[PDB]
């Protein structure tokens, strides 16, 4: 239902571990969905290539991001540094939850995170925009390179892009 799919190749140390496509619910949350879509294609002058999952915790979530202004942002939006959410439709009631990372409300639009587990303690907070439709096994494989403190023993970069639309 006018849902864009964003496709990536997930690579550990540059070596393709697999590939993950995410269904963006643009019919529900058009702002936060098209935001990440325009980051990944980079038509807004950003071109998010090689996006490194540098912050991953097992039994929780695998979070990716970029080197551009890594301090305090590290993966800014088409709204720039940070923006406020459109509407809190999509709750974190499932696995593979693709949602852009934040410190809180009006601080969304810096990096992204994929909740490998159903993180329900993230309800009443920043809304989801997409979910892993294919490659959830690769997402939980990324999780296995992460550490409890947020450390990543392996350098998991988004090798390539090419959204299925």
């Amino acid at each position: 239902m006018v849902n864009p799919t964003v496709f990536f190749d997930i690579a550990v140390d540059g070596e393709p571990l697999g590939r993950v496509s995410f269904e963006l619910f643009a019919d529900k949350v058009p702002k936060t969905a098209e935001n990440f879509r325009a980051l990944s294609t980079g038509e807004k002058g950003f071109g998010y290539k090689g996006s490194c999952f540098h912050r991953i915790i097992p039994g929780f979530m695998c979070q990716g991001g970029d080197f551009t202004r890594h301090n305090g942002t590290g993966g800014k939006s088409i709204y720039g540094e940070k923006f406020e959410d459109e509407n809190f439709i999509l709750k974190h009631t499932g696995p593979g939850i693709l949602s852009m990372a934040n410190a809180g409300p009006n601080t969304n639009g810096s990096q992204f995170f994929i909740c490998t587990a159903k993180t329900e303690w993230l309800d009443g907070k920043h809304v989801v925009f997409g979910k892993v439709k294919e490659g959830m096994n690769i997402v939980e494989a990324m999780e296995r390179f992460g550490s409890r403190n947020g450390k990543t023993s392996k350098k998991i970069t988004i090798a390539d892009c090419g959204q299925l639309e």
């Binding site: 915790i57 305090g72 410190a103 993180t119």
Partner: peptide
């Protein structure tokens, strides 16, 4: 201590 969610005390 960064833009990102938390869990696991």
């Amino acid at each position: 201590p960064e833009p990102g969610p938390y869990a696991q005390p």
